[PDB]
Design a protein around this nucleic acid. Structure first.
Ligand SMILES: [Mg+2]
Length: 811
RNA sequence: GCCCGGAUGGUGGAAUCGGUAGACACAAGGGAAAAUCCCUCGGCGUUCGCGCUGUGCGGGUUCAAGUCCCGCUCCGGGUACCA
């Protein structure tokens, strides 16, 4: 055994070994309990960032630990490889998105190996290859044939009316919302975000006649109980009613054009009068900047007495404000300053007077419904999923338009529709749109023009978790047996910022696949763990020109007070720096830290250990070089204790019967430590305290004598235990130390240590004696003494009723 | 302005159970320039044994609150008129 620990001499040999033995490659083995540990797949930007390192170290810790518990563990890796950055890099360099992307995959793959992540590399996928995207193209054709796909012009952000393909995600909204109650092991924050994003709404559509106007006008309301307080209707700027009025009304015309471009209220009277269906009285119709064209019908019944936006519009333009709901105490409301918003009992409402809110809602709805001018309607904030982009670097959309004018899917025997990778980019137009020949094809015997827009990249990320189960299956999108063996994912790890995009889409996609017969479960992941951001100090100076210039913390020369807080700071050019604290990492604050640099400076194991020790997985992590150094020193001390132990040669069989009292207490701490680290990693997922627990045991182990045969036999049992406990975190050093300790086989398939129950029995326990809360004594008592026995030993104490067994007496 | 989180030593963080506050580590300081190693370290008071105090500020429950409830202050993050 070398005296010095040198990761440059250990890590790449161990990595090569994991590749040569295919250590982390797995199959669908029915004789073992499965565990699917998934980290959000990287985008191949060019190099790993510290967030990848954190995300993927947490997943690797869990994957390795679950393998040591005897489970069959799937930990897959792949590349979300289409998307926008590659077209910008292609143009800037003078290349193409494909070769740039594949070069990045190669470089980042080598980085992930250099971190020692135990992936099943046989299942590696890059989502830009036709072997991947072909199945989403087929799947999109099936969705279309099932009526879940349509095309429409919609406003994207300046503002454009762009045609797009939509998947009807709203067909599944109820279930996406309802099934959140199944998600016990997702965090409350992500669930609430999804609930609010979905925005389920129960209401009524109400249709109005409109004088001297060709069509009726339908509004959506969530408060039909306030119907007799409706003093005007309001319509979105883009509504066809406003469009019409706008032909004779230049005031309106300019308002409608103002709105197309650009929380104040703004509006123009359209001059149209709608007829109130109950009273029969005319009310004015206004165009209003606060009504969304895209939601509901894009028109509202305005009740300024009881909706604050309607109140502020009516106050500004002098429209009638009419009260129809009473205050909590049955008094008429004070509307002199703002709307009365709470649901109450109606007044000023004729036949509907005295009705409470639920009764009012129902009665006014029932009456409009029977009059043929209302109907109950559930709406959603959630929009349908717009899946097309006017971009080149993505999966082609499998639709065609025949010479006819007719629209249909690309035939089965013409899938995949292949994105050509050999292209020159002009910056301006997609190569498959710039070339008129590419879109020309033939379908059902006739000349067609095929779609040139491509899929948004969330299309590929919505199902990759499932394809990892059967990545080389050529017969379909999924081998249902393989997918149902591995799914649902046991734990999915990735940031909270994906909460209402990817983390909603993959739930939807899972359900589509369920309803196609492809999987047999309702949800794709049991547990979601959202790891915190990695932070770093940030500094700037102000130039003579008044501009802020940000300076990397490595270039900061800081000065620290008596208590170590930063009091001044300068750069080597002499600029006075202002310290802004720990801050999210960015190129803008110039405070990013390159994990490659750190891996080369300290070794992967040090970087992994620091990242798991510094803070709980779900909280923010403050990157501190003094902290990383501290981790490196710990591993060096573990290396030292093993070197000195093995230097003494082989070990006698431990004889538990003949152990000394000290020996017995020391062994007790080995086994308690095993029990805690197990519970911390396996159930609590408190990785930082699991490590602290190992460190506290080492501190004792470094003190134990090791001359007598038994002392050494005990250290052997301790160190075999420590090396295994540390292995999910620091597997390179631990792989090597296991061999030095002559552990059996490779550490990766060694059994996780189990605490010996015999080793942990206490002869005695300590009891704190308090008088009136404040501690006045401490006493040792048998782990079997009765109250009165305990309270008697209590009484005997010269300084010395509530009693917790084994813990506390308070008098 | 909304919805959802936070607040413990000089610092990151422990306290899982309402029951010994500060494990573990960093930073300091003392020990045998740099590096390693070993001991001290919440604040104040001290006759060096210890005493009083202490979890942003208030209050409620409790025999007992960092923990559970309710206010106030101050810190972060999402969401842009969804009728
Ligand atoms: Mg603090």
């Amino acid at each position: 055994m070398q005296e010095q620990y040198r990761p440059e001499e250990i890590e790449s040999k161990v990595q090569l070994h994991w590749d040569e033995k295919r250590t982390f490659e797995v199959t669908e083995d029915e004789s073992k309990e499965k565990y699917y540990c998934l980290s959000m797949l990287p985008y191949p930007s060019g190099r790993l960032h510290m967030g990848h390192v954190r995300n993927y170290t947490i997943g690797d810790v869990i994957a390795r630990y679950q393998r040591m518990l005897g489970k069959n563990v799937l930990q897959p890796i792949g590349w979300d490889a289409f998307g926008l950055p590659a077209e910008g890099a292609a143009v800037k360099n003078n290349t193409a998105p494909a070769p740039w992307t594949y070069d990045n995959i190669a470089y980042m793959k080598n980085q992930l190996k250099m971190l020692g992540f135990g992936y099943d590399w046989s299942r590696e996928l890059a989502t830009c290859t036709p072997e991947y995207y072909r199945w989403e193209q087929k799947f999109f054709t099936e969705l279309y044939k099932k009526g879940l796909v349509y095309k429409k012009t919609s406003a994207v952000n300046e503002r454009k009316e762009i045609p797009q393909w939509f998947i009807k995600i709203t067909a599944y909204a109820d279930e996406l919302l309802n099934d959140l109650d199944k998600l016990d092991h997702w965090p409350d924050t992500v669930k609430t975000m999804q609930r609010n994003w979905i925005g389920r709404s129960e209401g009524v559509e109400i249709t109005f006649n409109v004088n001297d106007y060709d069509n009726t006008l339908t509004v959506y309301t969530t408060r039909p109980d306030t119907f007799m307080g409706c003093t005007y209707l309001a319509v979105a700027a883009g509504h066809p009613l406003a469009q019409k009025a706008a032909e004779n009304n230049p005031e309106l015309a300019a308002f409608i054009d103002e709105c197309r471009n650009t929380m104040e209220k703004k509006g123009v009277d359209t001059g149209f009068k709608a007829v109130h269906p109950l009273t029969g009285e005319e009310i004015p119709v206004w165009a209003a900047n606060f009504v969304l064209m895209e939601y509901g019908t894009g028109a509202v019944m305005a009740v300024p007495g009881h909706d604050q936006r309607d109140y502020e519009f009516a106050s500004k333009y002098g429209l009638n404000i009419k009260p129809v709901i009473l205050a909590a105490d049955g008094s008429e409301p004070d509307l002199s300053q703002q709307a009365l918003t709470e649901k109450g009992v109606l007044f000023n409402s004729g036949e509907f007077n005295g009705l409470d809110h639920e009764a009012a809602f129902n009665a006014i709805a029932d009456k409009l419904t029977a009059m043929g001018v209302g109907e109950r309607k559930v709406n959603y904030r959630l929009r349908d999923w717009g899946v097309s982009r006017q971009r080149y670097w993505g999966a082609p959309i499998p639709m065609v338009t025949l010479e006819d004018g007719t629209v249909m899917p690309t035939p089965d025997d013409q899938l995949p529709v292949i994105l050509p990778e050999d292209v020159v980019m002009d910056g301006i137009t997609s190569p498959i749109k710039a070339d008129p020949e590419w879109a020309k094809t033939t379908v059902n015997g006739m000349p067609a023009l095929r779609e040139t827009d491509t899929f948004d990249t969330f299309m590929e990320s919505s199902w990759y978790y499932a394809r990892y189960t059967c990545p080389q299956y050529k017969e379909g999108m999924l081998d249902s047996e393989a997918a149902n063996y591995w799914l649902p994912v046991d734990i999915y790890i990735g940031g909270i910022e994906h909460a209402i995009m990817h983390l909603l889409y993959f739930r939807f996609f899972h359900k589509l696949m369920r309803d196609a017969g492809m999987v047999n479960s309702d949800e794709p992941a049991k547990q979601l763990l959202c790891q915190g951001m990695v932070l770093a100090d940030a500094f700037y100076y102000v130039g003579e020109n008044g501009e802020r210039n940000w300076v990397s913390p490595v270039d900061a020369i800081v000065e620290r007070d008596e208590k170590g807080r930063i009091v001044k700071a300068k750069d080597a050019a002499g600029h006075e720096l202002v310290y802004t604290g720990m801050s999210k990492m960015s190129k803008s604050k110039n405070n990013g830290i390159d994990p490659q640099v750190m891996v080369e400076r300290y070794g992967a194991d040090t970087v992994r250990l620091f990242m798991m020790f510094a803070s709980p997985a779900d909280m923010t992590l403050e990157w501190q070089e003094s902290g990383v150094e501290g981790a490196n020193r710990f591993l060096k001390r573990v290396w030292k204790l093993v070197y000195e132990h093995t230097a003494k040669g082989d070990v006698a069989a431990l004889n538990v019967d003949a152990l000394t009292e000290n020996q017995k207490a020391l062994r007790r701490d080995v086994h308690k430590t095993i029990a805690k680290v197990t519970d911390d990693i396996g159930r609590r997922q408190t990785f930082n305290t699991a490590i602290a627990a190992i460190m506290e045991l080492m501190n004792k182990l470094a003190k134990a004598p090791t001359d007598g045969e038994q002392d050494r036999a005990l250290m052997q049992e301790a160190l075999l235990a420590v090396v295994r406990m540390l292995n999910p975190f620091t597997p390179h050093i631990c792989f090597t130390l296991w061999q030095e300790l002559k552990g059996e086989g490779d550490i990766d398939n060694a059994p996780w240590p189990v605490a010996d129950e015999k080793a942990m029995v206490e002869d005695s326990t300590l009891v704190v004696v308090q008088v009136n809360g404040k501690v006045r004594a401490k006493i040792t008592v048998p782990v079997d003494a009765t109250e009165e026995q305990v309270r008697e030993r209590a009484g005997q104490e010269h300084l010395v009723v509530i009693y917790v067994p084994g813990k506390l007496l308070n008098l």
